[PDB]
Ligand binder design. Structure first.
Ligand SMILES: Nc1ncnc2c1ncn2[C@@H]1O[C@H](COP(=O)(O)OP(=O)(O)O)[C@@H](O)[C@H]1O
Ligand SMILES: Nc1ncnc2c1ncn2[C@@H]1O[C@H](COP(=O)(O)OP(=O)(O)O)[C@@H](O)[C@H]1O
Ligand SMILES: Nc1ncnc2c1ncn2[C@@H]1O[C@H](COP(=O)(O)OP(=O)(O)O)[C@@H](O)[C@H]1O
Ligand SMILES: [Mg+2]
Ligand SMILES: [Mg+2]
Ligand SMILES: [Mg+2]
Lengths: 49, 366, 344, 165, 359, 359
């Protein structure tokens, strides 16, 4: 009653280590406001310049 | 109705959120009989131990901000909820306070006791220094919290705390109380037992003050009797104290009186400011906030103002903020915070703690 | 422990100050909650921890020389932490474990097998579990204020008493040698109470005596030979011992040992380790926050000879049945030994 | 403070023993390895006990262990002040330091123990630069090599006078 | 010829510098009717008078009565004129700075002493043992002090005071001697009980084992003869009276024993010098003169100190008057002459001169 | 017989040329009452005085205090007369030219040394490893320097300074030790914390994985004995304290870690020598003596440098005193006797001669 009932009130974010990232990607410089990234369980697609 | 519990080393303040003063303030002592009963309760907590202290051994579960006995600590909490507040801890959320730079192990024990022993529906732990600044209506300033166990200087700028600039001084009201006992023997009054410690503490709270110029004050007391005051012991004798009135609080500024190698509270506050960034030292010099019962001596604000301006550059405006209710600043700030509508997102429910553990308490807290 | 969980095992002769670097049994990945020695093996101990596993360990004869991290068996059948462990009094290598998931598991330590699973009998948290005299039944105190008597072999509820103690504070329940259940609990006013129950008629307790109004659960230590129950509360500085007889009120207060230090835990040495020649009937290892202080309970007797009445035959370190035979349904009393040879 | 003064002979000996001047090996053999200080006959000045000293050149030819011999010249029932030039090697450096030793055995007479103890802080202030102090009150606190080694660097000392502990 | 005066809490020790033992040892009391009698005279009249201790706990609280004691010391006990001899005074640890100047003013103006000096009692005991660092457990008549000293300077913050000494043990011996049927209540009987305490009492290494030994046989029973010829026998009371030092709960006192007081004061010093204090524990005072107390102190402290710590308790055979003997040897040195506070110096700097010449 | 003096930020290393290890290693502080104590003498008195660092960050700020340290080094530590031996001094990188002349004036006019040579600490470390081109990550007591060197000449424009070294790690170790209940606050307990850091701390290859291991078992726990016999246990603090080198945000500092400072200084050099500096990264100083620091630096820099570059972190086992050992061999060479600044050459050219004789 004191606290709203939920399971995700304590979800916290944590970036992966530097060795698990993707460096040297010339991300696109288009002013359009899109996600610029689409990822599936297989590949990773990033709009590049 | 939320509860605000402020466990100090010497006193325990408890009440309800939204009120302006703590409802229950009692000493944090546990007394056990030291004689043998001859006429046909093995422990006393709080004011009950204070009225029977003639035949009890008084012990503080907290010494220097460290819980020396968690089994006696649960007695203080049990006395608070059931005997002083007279409420069920399983029906009200509890807002606890913690010392700055509190160990995570100490915080883990507190939340585990509240959730497993007292079964509180919700709980939250807040920094005492942050709450002390809430009561004064500020988001910027260095808080010099001095209580019974330890003295802390916590600089805060625009609501951002600087943990690297937090300084600790192992010198508080209890050390001054013991020092007053040592210097009282030079006058012919002997106080040795733990029961007589409370008598000396009551003397300190009533006849001690901070002298603006210590050396000049010594000369005045050595050539006049205008600084001598009388105190009546509980059993009827009257004692008179001269220079001991301002020699006991003077140890706060010259800890060498206690054989301590550290610096006084005036230099500790200055050193904490100097550990911060240059651009924010200006706002901290003008927003020095005093907190705790050890800062309630008459004239301590004037002495603190005089000592800091001698350390700070001449172009700086030193402003010591000493509200008249600073003995309950931590509690009052907690009452304000617990009543905020935007604070309801910080409660840690019992159900959440049972599945996630103490990891969620280290987060959501500072 | 800084990480995981451990318990310190040292020989009784290793008194005095203990090295901070003394090897410990550090194999659990979570804090250890309960430990219990094997009644039929003075070198086997079972431990339960937060990591939802029960580990059985083998202690060398001379003690620990290096930290022990590999257990003999790892029993994994619980989804939550295991805080209750009770060896079988007679059956060899039969172990009971009760966790926070309200499930009771009967293990076979020799073969790492799960003999029985009792999961739909406790609707709330289990406080403690105690075997009966012959190891055929066990009583349990639950968070729902109910005391239950359960036969593990048939998975049935032999007897059950709702609202044994009206208080919301934790309570205990142990089995006596004559077949009764001794319970310590709290009243509605939160007054600590002791109760005696007959399983054949659980309508009302035989006895109900109030002790005080202090906090902390009362941990009873029953001595079958002397029919004396020692009530030791967590946080109390006093030990109260009562004698259970057939005369009313069936619970007789004997005396109280008083000290000035609160206790964090207690363990009682079995009959085989007592100094019989000094009229010793119990020795309690009272735990402070940084010290273990044994407490000696002695009967004042003028004669220095052996007291035959004070020391009847006690259960020996020899198992009566085997693990396999007990599953079939065989029941046998513990093998009794004598205490006379230990007189000096 | 008993007011006992330090004689000019003691100051010169300590000054020569503290700092080392570039000299021929013949003069290096004349450097003092250990020396004893005692009260004068009138008990007014602290003077040099004649004949009770160890030379650097004596080490390795007549004296095998300089510390073992140094302990022997200490009287059994009298108090003395000692200056021992310790040569020890720790785990990462080889050190050569001065050790001022206060020898006050229990068997010593009461008058001797009182004067030596009361004037120790006065002579020690005149002998500036000494970072090592050894107060021995019985033969067992001074004969053991590990006692000096424990004082000099604790457990960091692995050798003393060229010999492992 | 210099004078050494050791103003103890219950006994005043006086003598001449260069002597091996004090010339006069008398109680430091002043008697008034229930017109003024000081010393053994105040005890000779017994119960007609009321007795007061001006230095009851090491610190002088009645300066008028203190001058009577010093006047009695010089003229009746030492039998010399104080204006012809320098006087060396001793003071208790933690003695207030106001008391040092009051002593200086009295000695120079009331007695007109040519020279004066003040020394700490604890430091003199440590010096007499041939040490400059260590802890001195000075247990006298009305007060017991544990004074840790480093390089000849007592650490004021680490000094612990215990109001439990031979005066309390003498009163305790009376209370337990009545359990055998004897009656010692008068002032005259007090000196008899104090005599019994000093000749027959000893410290038991293990109290419980010793109590069992005395309760099963009669090997521990000793006989004492009263001044009027009656003979009394004491059994287990020999080790029960001094046991109150290690168990103050026998007297109803909440404080800890002398072994815990010694350990607590060491723990209040710097961690660096705790090793030196453990191996340089020096005993002093008349209360310590019980046989077997050094062994009991060694055992008790060892159980408290870490197992790697090396504990020695130093109990010199002359520890009863080490404060006086240490002061007598020091005052007899020709090199100690320049350390006196002369009357010419006092007339210039006033009573405050004692702070810079005697520290 | 030449003298080698390595004026470090917090520790002064001194010895004789030709020796394998420095004879004296003492802190470089001067203590004055809260009258002047230098080195370990200022530390033995502990907190009665206040301590000042004249060379706090490699650059000498208080020359009057610096002469006291040099006075303490020659006469009290090395126990030699500076006027009889040539002295080889060492300096931090980016040392202003005025400081070089001031050292020249002090040596010849205050100590009258027959000869003096001044060398860069970073270059000496590189030479001691058998290299002429490379980057030296000198992490000392009060300052950390990354000095890229090409053909024996340090590139001043690419030298980066980090105010994060062993002194800040020692203070951080107290702040995290108080989380276990221990209390180290006085300067006496600062050397105990420093001794714990030098004996039980190590750099974890993966910090987050090491945190999980320390939270699930006690295999990483170690016990340390205090001087007074108490034993303390430290767990995850072993690798949390040196982790502040790679994550300066642990101390509230904005600057980057030692791995990024090394990479940033390399990127400030010419592109045609960056490949050589990647494979010749040499560690130096006391703060680089933690076990596992070379592996961590290799992993961190590889993640920053291009994947086609070959990274080799050189951590010689004697890198703690590589500056002094490099200077000791150089001063002991018979061919090096012509490189000294003779006193005769000092009178003709003045202090400015150090610029043309020592570069
Ligand atoms: N008016 C007063 N003057 C001087 N000291 C006081 C006064 N009131 C309280 N104190 C001292 O403040 C100390 C601690 O008070 P408090 O701030 O409640 O401590 P805590 O924060 O530990 O609860 C007490 O020991 C008491 O001696
Ligand atoms: N041989 C002894 N054994 C035990 N106690 C003694 C002995 N001699 C003296 N005492 C006790 O010592 C006490 C006073 O001794 P002293 O050290 O002179 O006291 P103070 O230093 O206070 O003057 C007396 O009360 C006496 O009971
Ligand atoms: N074995 C070690 N492990 C970790 N740190 C060490 C070790 N030895 C020394 N240190 C640290 O190195 C620091 C200074 O060493 P050093 O490189 O000589 O500094 P500087 O060059 O400034 O004199 C000291 O603060 C000390 O804490
Ligand atoms: Mg508070
Ligand atoms: Mg005395
Ligand atoms: Mg360096």
């Amino acid at each position: 009653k004191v606290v709203r009932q939920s399971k995700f009130r304590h979800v916290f974010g944590q970036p992966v280590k530097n060795d698990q990232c993707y460096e040297d990607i010339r991300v696109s410089r288009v002013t359009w406001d899109s996600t610029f990234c689409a990822v599936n369980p297989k590949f990773l697609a990033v709009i590049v310049e | 109705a939320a509860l605000v519990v402020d466990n100090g080393s010497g006193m325990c303040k408890a009440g309800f959120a939204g009120d302006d003063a703590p409802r229950a303030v009692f000493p944090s002592i546990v007394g056990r009989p030291r004689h043998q009963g001859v006429m046909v309760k093995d422990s006393y907590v709080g004011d009950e131990a204070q009225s029977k202290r003639g035949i009890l051994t008084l012990k503080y579960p907290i010494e220097h901000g460290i819980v020396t006995n968690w089994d006696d600590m649960e007695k203080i909490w049990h006395h608070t909820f059931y005997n002083e507040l007279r409420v069920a801890p399983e029906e009200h959320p509890v807002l606890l306070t913690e010392a700055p730079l509190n160990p995570k192990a100490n915080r883990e024990k507190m939340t585990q006791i509240m959730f497993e022993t007292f079964n509180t529906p919700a709980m939250y732990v807040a920094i005492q220094a942050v709450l002390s600044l809430y009561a004064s209506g500020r988001t910027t300033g260095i808080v010099m919290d001095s209580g019974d166990g330890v003295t802390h200087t916590v600089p805060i700028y625009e609501g951002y705390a600087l943990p690297h600039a937090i300084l600790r001084l192992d010198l508080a009201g209890r050390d001054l109380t013991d020092y007053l006992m040592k210097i009282l023997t030079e006058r012919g009054y002997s106080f040795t037992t733990t029961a007589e410690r409370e008598i000396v503490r009551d003397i300190k709270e009533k006849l001690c003050y901070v002298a603006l110029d210590f050396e000049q004050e010594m000369a005045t007391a050595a050539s006049s009797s205008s600084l001598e005051k009388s105190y009546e012991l509980p059993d009827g004798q009257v004692i008179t104290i001269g220079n001991e009135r301002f020699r006991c609080p003077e140890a706060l500024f010259q800890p060498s009186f206690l054989g301590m190698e550290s610096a006084g509270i005036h230099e500790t506050t200055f050193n904490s400011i100097m550990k911060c960034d240059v651009d924010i030292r200006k706002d901290l010099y003008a927003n020095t906030v005093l907190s705790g019962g050890t800062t309630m001596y008459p004239g301590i604000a004037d002495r603190m103002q005089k000592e800091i301006t001698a350390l700070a550059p001449s172009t700086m405006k030193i402003k010591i903020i000493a509200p008249p209710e600073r003995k309950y600043s931590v509690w009052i700030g907690g009452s304000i915070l617990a009543s905020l509508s935007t604070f309801q997102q910080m409660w840690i429910s019992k159900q959440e703690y049972d599945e996630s553990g103490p990891s969620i308490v280290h987060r959501k807290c500072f | 422990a800084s990480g995981g969980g451990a318990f310190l095992v040292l020989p009784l002769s290793k008194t005095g100050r203990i090295d901070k670097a003394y090897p410990t049994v550090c194999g659990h990945t979570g804090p250890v909650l309960d430990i219990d020695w094997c009644p039929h093996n003075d070198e086997v101990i079972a431990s339960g921890s937060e990591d939802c596993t029960v580990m059985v360990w083998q202690i060398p004869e001379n003690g620990l020389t290096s930290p022990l991290t590999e257990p003999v068996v790892v029993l994994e059948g619980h989804t939550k932490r295991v805080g209750i462990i009770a060896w079988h009094p007679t059956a060899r290598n039969v172990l009971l474990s009760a966790g926070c998931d309200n499930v009771v598991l009967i293990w076979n330590v020799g073969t790492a097998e799960e003999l029985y699973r009792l999961d739909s009998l406790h609707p709330d948290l289990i406080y403690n579990v105690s075997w009966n005299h012959n190891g055929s039944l066990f009583c349990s105190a639950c968070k729902d204020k109910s005391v239950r008597i359960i036969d593990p072999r048939r998975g049935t509820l032999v007897a059950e008493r709702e609202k044994a103690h009206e208080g919301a504070r934790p309570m205990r329940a142990i089995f006596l040698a004559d077949g009764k259940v001794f319970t310590t609990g709290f009243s509605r006013m939160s007054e600590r109470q002791l109760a005696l129950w007959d399983p054949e008629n659980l309508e009302e307790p035989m006895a109900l005596q109030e002790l005080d109004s202090s906090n902390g659960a009362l941990l009873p230590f029953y001595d079958p030979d002397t029919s004396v129950v020692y009530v030791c509360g967590k946080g109390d500085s006093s030990i109260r011992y009562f004698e259970i007889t057939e005369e009313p009120p069936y619970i007789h207060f004997l005396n109280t040992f008083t000290s000035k230090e609160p206790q964090r835990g207690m363990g009682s040495m079995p009959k085989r380790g007592l100094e019989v020649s000094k009229c010793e009937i119990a020795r309690f290892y009272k735990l402070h926050e940084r010290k273990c202080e044994p407490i000696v309970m002695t009967v004042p007797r003028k004669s220095d000879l052996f007291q035959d009445d004070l020391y009847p035959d006690t259960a020996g370190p020899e198992a009566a049945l085997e693990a396999e035979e007990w599953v079939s349904g065989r029941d046998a009393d513990p093998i009794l030994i004598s205490l006379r040879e230990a007189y000096v | 403070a008993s007011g006992v003064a330090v004689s000019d002979g003691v100051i010169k000996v300590f000054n020569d023993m503290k700092v080392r001047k570039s000299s021929t090996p013949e003069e290096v053999k004349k450097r003092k390895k250990a020396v004893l200080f005692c009260l004068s006959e009138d008990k007014k000045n602290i003077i040099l006990e004649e004949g009770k000293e160890i030379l650097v050149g004596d080490v390795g030819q007549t004296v095998d262990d300089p510390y073992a011999t140094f302990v022997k010249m200490l009287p059994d029932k009298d108090c003395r002040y000692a200056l021992y030039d310790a040569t020890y090697e720790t785990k990462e450096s080889k050190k050569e330091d001065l050790v001022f030793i206060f020898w006050a055995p229990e068997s010593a007479p009461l008058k001797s123990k009182m004067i030596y103890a009361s004037s120790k802080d006065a002579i020690k202030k005149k002998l500036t630069g000494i970072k090592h102090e050894l107060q021995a009150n019985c033969y067992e606190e001074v004969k053991d090599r590990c006692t000096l080694a424990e004082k000099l660097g604790g457990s960091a000392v692995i050798s003393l006078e060229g010999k492992p502990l």
